[PDB]
Short mmCIF file of C-alpha atoms and ligand atoms in Angstrom, two decimals:
data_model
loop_
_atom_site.label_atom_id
_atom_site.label_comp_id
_atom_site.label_asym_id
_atom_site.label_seq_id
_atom_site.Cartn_x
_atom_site.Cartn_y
_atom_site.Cartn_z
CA UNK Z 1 0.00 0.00 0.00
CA UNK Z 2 2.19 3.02 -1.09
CA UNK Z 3 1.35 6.21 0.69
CA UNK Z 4 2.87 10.22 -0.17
CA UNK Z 5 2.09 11.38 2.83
CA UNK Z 6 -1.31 11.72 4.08
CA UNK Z 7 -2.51 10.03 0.44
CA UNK Z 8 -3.06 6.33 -0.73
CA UNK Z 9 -1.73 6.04 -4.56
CA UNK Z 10 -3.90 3.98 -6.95
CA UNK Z 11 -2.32 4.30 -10.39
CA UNK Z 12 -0.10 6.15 -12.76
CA UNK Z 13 -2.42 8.84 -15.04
CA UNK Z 14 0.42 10.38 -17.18
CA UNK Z 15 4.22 10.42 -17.31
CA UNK Z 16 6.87 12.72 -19.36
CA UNK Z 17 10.06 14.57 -19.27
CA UNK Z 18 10.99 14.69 -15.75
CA UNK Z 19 6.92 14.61 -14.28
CA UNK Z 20 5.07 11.89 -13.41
CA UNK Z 21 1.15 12.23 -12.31
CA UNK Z 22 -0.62 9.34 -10.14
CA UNK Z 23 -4.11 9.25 -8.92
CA UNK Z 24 -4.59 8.53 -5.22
CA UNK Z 25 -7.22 8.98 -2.55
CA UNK Z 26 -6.39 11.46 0.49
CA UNK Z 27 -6.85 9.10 3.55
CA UNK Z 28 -8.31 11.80 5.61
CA UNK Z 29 -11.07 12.90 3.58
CA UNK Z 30 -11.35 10.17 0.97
CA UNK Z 31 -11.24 12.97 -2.13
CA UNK Z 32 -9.32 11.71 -5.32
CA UNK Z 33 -6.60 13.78 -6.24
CA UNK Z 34 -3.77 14.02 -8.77
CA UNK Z 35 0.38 13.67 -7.68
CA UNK Z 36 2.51 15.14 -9.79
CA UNK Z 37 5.67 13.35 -8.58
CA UNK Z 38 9.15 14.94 -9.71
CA UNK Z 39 12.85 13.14 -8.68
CA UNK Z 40 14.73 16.40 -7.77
CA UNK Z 41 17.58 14.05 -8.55
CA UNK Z 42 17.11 14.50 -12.41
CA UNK Z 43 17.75 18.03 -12.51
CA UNK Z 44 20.53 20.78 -12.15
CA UNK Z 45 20.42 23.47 -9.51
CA UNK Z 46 19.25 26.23 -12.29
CA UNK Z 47 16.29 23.42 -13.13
CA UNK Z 48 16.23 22.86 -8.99
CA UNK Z 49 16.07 27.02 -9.14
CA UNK Z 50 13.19 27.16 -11.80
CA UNK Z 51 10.95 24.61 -10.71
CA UNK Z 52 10.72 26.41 -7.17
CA UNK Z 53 9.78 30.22 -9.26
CA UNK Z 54 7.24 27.84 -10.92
CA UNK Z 55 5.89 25.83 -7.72
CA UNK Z 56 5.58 29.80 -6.42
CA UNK Z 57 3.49 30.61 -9.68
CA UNK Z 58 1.06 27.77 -8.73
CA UNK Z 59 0.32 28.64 -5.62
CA UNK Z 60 -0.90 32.24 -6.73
CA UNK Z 61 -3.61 30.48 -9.55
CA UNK Z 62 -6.59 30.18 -8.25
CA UNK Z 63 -9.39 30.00 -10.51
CA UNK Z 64 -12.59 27.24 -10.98
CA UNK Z 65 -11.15 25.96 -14.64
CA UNK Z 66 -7.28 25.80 -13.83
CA UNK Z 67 -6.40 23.02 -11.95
CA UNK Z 68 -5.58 23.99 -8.48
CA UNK Z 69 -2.72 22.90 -5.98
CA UNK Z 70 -3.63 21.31 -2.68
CA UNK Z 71 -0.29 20.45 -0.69
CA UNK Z 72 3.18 20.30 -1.97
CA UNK Z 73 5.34 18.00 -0.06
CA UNK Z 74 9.10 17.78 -0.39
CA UNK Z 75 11.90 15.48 0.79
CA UNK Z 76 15.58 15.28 0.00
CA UNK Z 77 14.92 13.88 -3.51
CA UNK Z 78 11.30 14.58 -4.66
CA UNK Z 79 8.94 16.88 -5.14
CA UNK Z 80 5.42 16.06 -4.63
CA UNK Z 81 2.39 18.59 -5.56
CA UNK Z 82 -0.91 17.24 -4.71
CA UNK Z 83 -3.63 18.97 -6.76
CA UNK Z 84 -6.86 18.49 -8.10
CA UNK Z 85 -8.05 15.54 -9.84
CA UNK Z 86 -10.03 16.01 -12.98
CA UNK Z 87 -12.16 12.74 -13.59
CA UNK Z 88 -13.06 13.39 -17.53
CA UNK Z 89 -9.94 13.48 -18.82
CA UNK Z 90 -9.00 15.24 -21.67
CA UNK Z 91 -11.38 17.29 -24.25
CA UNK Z 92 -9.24 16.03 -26.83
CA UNK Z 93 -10.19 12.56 -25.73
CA UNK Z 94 -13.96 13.19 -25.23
CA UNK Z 95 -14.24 15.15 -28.57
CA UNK Z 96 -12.84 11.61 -30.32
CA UNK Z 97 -15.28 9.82 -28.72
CA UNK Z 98 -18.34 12.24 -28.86
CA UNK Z 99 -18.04 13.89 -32.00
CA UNK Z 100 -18.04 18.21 -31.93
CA UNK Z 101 -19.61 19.66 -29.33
CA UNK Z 102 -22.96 21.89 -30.49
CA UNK Z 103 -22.12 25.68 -30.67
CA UNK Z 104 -24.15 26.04 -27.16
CA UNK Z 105 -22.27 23.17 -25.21
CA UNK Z 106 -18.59 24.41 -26.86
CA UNK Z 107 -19.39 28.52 -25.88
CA UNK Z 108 -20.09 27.39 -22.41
CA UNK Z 109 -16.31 25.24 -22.12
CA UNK Z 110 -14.75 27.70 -24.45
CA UNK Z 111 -15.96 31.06 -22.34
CA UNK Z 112 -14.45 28.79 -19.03
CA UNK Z 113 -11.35 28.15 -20.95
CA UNK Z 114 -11.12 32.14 -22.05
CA UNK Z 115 -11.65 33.31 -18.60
CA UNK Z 116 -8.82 30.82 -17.05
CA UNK Z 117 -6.31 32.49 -19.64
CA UNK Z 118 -7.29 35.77 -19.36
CA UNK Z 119 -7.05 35.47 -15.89
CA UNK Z 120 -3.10 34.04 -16.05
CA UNK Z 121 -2.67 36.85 -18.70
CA UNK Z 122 -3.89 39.43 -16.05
CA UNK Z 123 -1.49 38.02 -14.13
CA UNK Z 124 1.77 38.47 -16.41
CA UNK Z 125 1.42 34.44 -16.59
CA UNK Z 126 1.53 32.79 -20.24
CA UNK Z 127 0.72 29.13 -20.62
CA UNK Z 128 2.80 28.95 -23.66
CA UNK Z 129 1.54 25.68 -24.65
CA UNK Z 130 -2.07 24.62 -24.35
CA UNK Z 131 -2.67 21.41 -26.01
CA UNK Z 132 -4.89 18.03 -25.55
CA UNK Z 133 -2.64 16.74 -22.72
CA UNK Z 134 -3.66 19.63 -20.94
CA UNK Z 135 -7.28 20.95 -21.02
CA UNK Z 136 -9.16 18.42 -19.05
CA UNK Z 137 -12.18 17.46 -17.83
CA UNK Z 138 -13.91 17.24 -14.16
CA UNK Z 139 -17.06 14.64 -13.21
CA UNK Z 140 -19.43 17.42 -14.27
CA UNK Z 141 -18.19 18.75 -17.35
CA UNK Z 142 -16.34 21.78 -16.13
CA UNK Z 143 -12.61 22.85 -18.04
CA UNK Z 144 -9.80 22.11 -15.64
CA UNK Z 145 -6.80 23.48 -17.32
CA UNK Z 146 -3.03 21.85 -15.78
CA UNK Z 147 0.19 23.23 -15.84
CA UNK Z 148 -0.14 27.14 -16.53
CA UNK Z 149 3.37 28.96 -15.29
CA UNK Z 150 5.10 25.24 -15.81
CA UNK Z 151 8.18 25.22 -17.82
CA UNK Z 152 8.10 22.12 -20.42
CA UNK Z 153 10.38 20.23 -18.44
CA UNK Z 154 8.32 19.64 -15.83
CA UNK Z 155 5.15 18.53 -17.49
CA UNK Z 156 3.49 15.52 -18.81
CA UNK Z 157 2.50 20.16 -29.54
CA UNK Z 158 3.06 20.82 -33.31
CA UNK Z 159 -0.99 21.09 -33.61
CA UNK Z 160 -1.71 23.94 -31.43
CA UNK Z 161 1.73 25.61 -31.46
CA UNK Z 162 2.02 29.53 -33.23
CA UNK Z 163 3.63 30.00 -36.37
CA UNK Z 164 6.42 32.09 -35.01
CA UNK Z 165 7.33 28.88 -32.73
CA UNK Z 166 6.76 34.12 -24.80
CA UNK Z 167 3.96 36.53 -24.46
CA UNK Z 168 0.02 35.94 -24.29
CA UNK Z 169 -0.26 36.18 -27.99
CA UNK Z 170 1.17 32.45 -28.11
CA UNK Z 171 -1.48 31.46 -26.30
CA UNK Z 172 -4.01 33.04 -28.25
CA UNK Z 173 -3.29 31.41 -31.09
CA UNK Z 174 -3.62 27.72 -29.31
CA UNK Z 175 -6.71 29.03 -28.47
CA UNK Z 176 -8.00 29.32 -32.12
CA UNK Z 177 -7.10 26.01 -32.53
CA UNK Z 178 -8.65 24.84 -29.59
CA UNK Z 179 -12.06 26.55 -30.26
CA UNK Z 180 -11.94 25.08 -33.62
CA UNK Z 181 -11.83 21.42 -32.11
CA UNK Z 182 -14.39 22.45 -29.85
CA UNK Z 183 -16.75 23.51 -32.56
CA UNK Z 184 -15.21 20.79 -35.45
CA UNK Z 185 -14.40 17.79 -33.60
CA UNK Z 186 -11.26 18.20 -35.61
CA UNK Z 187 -8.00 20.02 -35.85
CA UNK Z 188 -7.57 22.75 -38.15
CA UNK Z 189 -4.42 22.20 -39.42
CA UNK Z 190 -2.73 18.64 -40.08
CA UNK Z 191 -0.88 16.71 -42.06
CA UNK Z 192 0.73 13.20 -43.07
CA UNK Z 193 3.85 14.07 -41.39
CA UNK Z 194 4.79 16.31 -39.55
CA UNK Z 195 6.69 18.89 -41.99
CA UNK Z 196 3.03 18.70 -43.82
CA UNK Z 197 1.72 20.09 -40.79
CA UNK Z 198 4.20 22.94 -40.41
CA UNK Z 199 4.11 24.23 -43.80
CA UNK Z 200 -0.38 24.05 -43.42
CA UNK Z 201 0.02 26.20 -40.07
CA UNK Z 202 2.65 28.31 -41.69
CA UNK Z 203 -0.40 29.07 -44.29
CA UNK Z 204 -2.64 29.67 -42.38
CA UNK Z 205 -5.73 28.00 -44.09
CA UNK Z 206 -8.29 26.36 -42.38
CA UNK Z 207 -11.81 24.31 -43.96
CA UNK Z 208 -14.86 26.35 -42.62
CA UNK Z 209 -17.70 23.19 -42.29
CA UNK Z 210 -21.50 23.65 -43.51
CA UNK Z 211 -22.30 23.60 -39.73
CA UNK Z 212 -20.23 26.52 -38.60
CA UNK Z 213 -21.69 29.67 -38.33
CA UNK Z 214 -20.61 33.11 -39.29
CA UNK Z 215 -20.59 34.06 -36.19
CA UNK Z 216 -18.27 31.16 -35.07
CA UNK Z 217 -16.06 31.87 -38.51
CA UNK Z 218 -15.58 35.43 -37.45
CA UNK Z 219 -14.56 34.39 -33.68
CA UNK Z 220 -11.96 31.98 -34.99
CA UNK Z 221 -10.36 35.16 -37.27
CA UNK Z 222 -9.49 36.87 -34.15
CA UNK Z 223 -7.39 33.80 -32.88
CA UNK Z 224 -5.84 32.36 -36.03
CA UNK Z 225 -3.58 35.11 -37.47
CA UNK Z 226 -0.26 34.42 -38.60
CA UNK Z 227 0.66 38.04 -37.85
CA UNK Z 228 0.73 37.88 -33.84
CA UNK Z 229 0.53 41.89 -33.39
CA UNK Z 230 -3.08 41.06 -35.44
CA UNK Z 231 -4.18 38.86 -32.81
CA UNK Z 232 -7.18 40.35 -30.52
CA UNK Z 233 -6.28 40.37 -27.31
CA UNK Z 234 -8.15 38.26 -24.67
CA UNK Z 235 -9.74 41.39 -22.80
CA UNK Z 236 -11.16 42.24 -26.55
CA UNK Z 237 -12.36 38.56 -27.49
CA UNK Z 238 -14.08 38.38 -24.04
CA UNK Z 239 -16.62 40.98 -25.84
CA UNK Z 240 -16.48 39.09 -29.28
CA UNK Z 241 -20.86 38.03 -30.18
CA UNK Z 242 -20.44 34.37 -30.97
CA UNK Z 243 -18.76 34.42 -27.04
CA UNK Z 244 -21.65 36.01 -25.58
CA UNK Z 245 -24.52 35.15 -27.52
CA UNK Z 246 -27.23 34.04 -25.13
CA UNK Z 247 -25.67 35.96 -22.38
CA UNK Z 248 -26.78 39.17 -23.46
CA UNK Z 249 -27.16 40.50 -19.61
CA UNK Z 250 -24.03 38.16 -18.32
CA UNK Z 251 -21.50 39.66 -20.75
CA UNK Z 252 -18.02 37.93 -20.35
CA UNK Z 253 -15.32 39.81 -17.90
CA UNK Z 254 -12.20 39.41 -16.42
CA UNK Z 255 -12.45 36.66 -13.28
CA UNK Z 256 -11.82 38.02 -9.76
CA UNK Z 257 -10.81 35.68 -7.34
CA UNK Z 258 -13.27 35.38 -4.04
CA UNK Z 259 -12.12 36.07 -0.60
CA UNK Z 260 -10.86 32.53 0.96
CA UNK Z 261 -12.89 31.79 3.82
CA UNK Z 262 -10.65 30.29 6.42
CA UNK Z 263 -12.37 30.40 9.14
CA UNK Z 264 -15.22 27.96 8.45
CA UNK Z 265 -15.68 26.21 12.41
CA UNK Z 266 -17.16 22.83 11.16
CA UNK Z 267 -14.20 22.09 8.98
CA UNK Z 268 -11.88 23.04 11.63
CA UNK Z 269 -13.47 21.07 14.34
CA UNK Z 270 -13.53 18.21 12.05
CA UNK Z 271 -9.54 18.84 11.75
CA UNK Z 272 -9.13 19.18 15.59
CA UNK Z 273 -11.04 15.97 15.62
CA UNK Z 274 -8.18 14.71 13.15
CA UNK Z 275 -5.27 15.39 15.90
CA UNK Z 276 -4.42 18.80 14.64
CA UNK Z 277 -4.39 21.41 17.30
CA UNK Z 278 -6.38 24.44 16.87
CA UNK Z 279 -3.26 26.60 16.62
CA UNK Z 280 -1.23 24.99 14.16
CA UNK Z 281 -4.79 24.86 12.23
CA UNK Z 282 -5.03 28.75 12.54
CA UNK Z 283 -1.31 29.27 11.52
CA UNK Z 284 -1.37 27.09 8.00
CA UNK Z 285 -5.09 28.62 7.15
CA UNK Z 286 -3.43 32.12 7.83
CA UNK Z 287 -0.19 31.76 6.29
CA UNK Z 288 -1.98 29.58 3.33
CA UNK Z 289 0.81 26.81 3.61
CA UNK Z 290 -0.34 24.48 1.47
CA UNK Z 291 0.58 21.87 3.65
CA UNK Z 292 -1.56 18.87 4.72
CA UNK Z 293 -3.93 21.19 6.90
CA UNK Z 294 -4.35 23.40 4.20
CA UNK Z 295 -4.62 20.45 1.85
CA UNK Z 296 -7.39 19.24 4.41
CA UNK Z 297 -9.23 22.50 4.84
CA UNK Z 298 -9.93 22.89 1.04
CA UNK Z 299 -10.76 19.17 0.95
CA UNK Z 300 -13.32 19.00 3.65
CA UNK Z 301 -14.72 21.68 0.98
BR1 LIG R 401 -2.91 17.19 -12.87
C1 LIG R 401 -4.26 16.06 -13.57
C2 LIG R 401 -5.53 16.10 -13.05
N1 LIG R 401 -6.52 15.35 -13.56
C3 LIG R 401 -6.17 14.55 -14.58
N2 LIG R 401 -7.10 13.62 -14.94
C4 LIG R 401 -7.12 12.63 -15.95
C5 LIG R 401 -6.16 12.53 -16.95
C6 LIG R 401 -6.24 11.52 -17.90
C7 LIG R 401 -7.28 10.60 -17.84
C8 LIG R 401 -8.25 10.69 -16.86
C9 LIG R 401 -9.35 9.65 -16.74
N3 LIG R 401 -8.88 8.27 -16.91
C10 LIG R 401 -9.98 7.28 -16.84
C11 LIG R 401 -10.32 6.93 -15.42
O1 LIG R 401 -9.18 6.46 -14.71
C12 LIG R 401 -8.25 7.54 -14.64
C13 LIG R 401 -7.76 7.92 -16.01
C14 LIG R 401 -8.18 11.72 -15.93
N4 LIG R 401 -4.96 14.45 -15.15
C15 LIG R 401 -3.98 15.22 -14.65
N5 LIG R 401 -2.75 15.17 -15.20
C16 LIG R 401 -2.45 14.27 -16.31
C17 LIG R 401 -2.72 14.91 -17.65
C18 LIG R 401 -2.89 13.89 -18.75
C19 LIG R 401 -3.19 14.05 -20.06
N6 LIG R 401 -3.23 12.82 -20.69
C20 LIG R 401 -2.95 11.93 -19.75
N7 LIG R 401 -2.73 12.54 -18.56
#
């Protein structure tokens, strides 16, 4: 029965580069959860260096469609950070399986996914790649996007990458391709190998579908532009028609985070029950830790 800490490991979810995620159960509150596991013995101490500025990133994301940290626990040799699970999987994934989704099913996960960059963006933070491996799905249907502010290094893609492959316009672009498979079911630009694929992003030319509507066309203009200067920014999409249509008095805006309430008494008598003493419960909700009382706290949530 492995344990990391205060959580029971089930299975292996995804693996690359120098990452490795598991699923496993918390043993105090039962709630799945995701481990990203990382040997600090792989890396130099300029990767040892970045991988802290990036942990620090992390803990300053908190939004309902980015994937948020619970508890990071470290020993001599690994890094552990314990965040949420998303039981979907990926859009990609479900989009194979499903078929497109219908223009009203694909606004509602594409204005989520908008709002989660926009939000980063607000926040001098630029995914730099958003791809399939990374825009995932929870047990109701809600975007959960992983690894915004994480170097590639420490993560688990020709299709959704710019042209001109660092600042937000990058990620606009991805997310012209990722409306498109949203809408399509398909990616815009592909290819028998994969210097066919470069040279059809490099041109820029996408099939519109008999089922796609102006409206939808004209959205996916303001993404795909080779020219990144003659990309609309996120703050200007957010006001785009196609993104709002049907939420004429609930116009799109930029997210602000609520107050944390850490001071709810049931959850902390439940974690006094636990063994934790009431002030080393008041010092990690204060200080926001993110340790396994924090962890707890957000869980019992
Ligand atoms: Br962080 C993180 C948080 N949530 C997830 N959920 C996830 C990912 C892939 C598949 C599934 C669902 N299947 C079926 C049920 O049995 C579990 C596995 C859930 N993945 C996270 N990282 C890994 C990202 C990833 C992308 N392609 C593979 N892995």
């Amino acid at each position: 029965q492995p344990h990391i800490g205060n959580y029971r490991l089930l299975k292996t979810i995804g693996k690359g580069n120098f990452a490795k995620v598991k699923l496993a159960r918390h043993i105090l509150t039962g709630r799945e959860v995701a481990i990203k596991i990382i040997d600090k013995t792989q890396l130099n101490p300029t990767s040892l260096q970045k991988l802290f500025r990036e942990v620090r990133i992390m803990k300053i994301l908190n939004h309902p469609n980015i994937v948020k940290l619970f508890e990071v626990i470290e020993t001599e040799k690994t890094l552990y950070l314990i965040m949420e699970y998303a039981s979907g999987g990926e859009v990609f994934d479900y989009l194979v399986a499903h078929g497109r989704m219908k223009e009203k099913e694909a606004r509602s996960k594409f204005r989520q996914i908008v709002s989660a960059v926009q939000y980063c963006h607000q926040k001098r933070i630029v995914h730099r790649d958003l791809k399939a491996e990374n825009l995932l799905l929870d047990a109701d249907m809600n975007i959960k996007i992983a690894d915004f502010g994480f170097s590639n290094e420490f993560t688990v893609s020709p299709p959704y990458a710019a042209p001109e492959l660092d600042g937000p316009e990058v990620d606009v672009w991805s997310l012209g391709v990722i409306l498109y498979t949203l809408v399509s079911g398909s990616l815009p630009f592909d290819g028998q190998n994969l210097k066919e694929l470069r040279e059809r992003v490099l041109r820029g030319k996408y099939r519109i579908p008999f089922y796609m509507s102006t409206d939808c066309e004209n959205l996916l203009k303001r993404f795909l532009v080779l020219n990144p200067i003659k990309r609309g920014t996120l703050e200007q999409i957010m006001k785009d028609r196609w993104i709002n249509a049907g939420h004429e008095e609930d116009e799109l805006k930029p997210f602000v985070e609520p107050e944390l309430d850490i001071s709810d008494q049931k959850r902390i008598d439940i974690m006094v029950g636990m063994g934790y003493s009431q002030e080393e419960i008041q010092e990690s909700l204060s200080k926001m830790k993110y340790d396994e009382i924090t962890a707890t706290y957000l869980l019992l949530g």
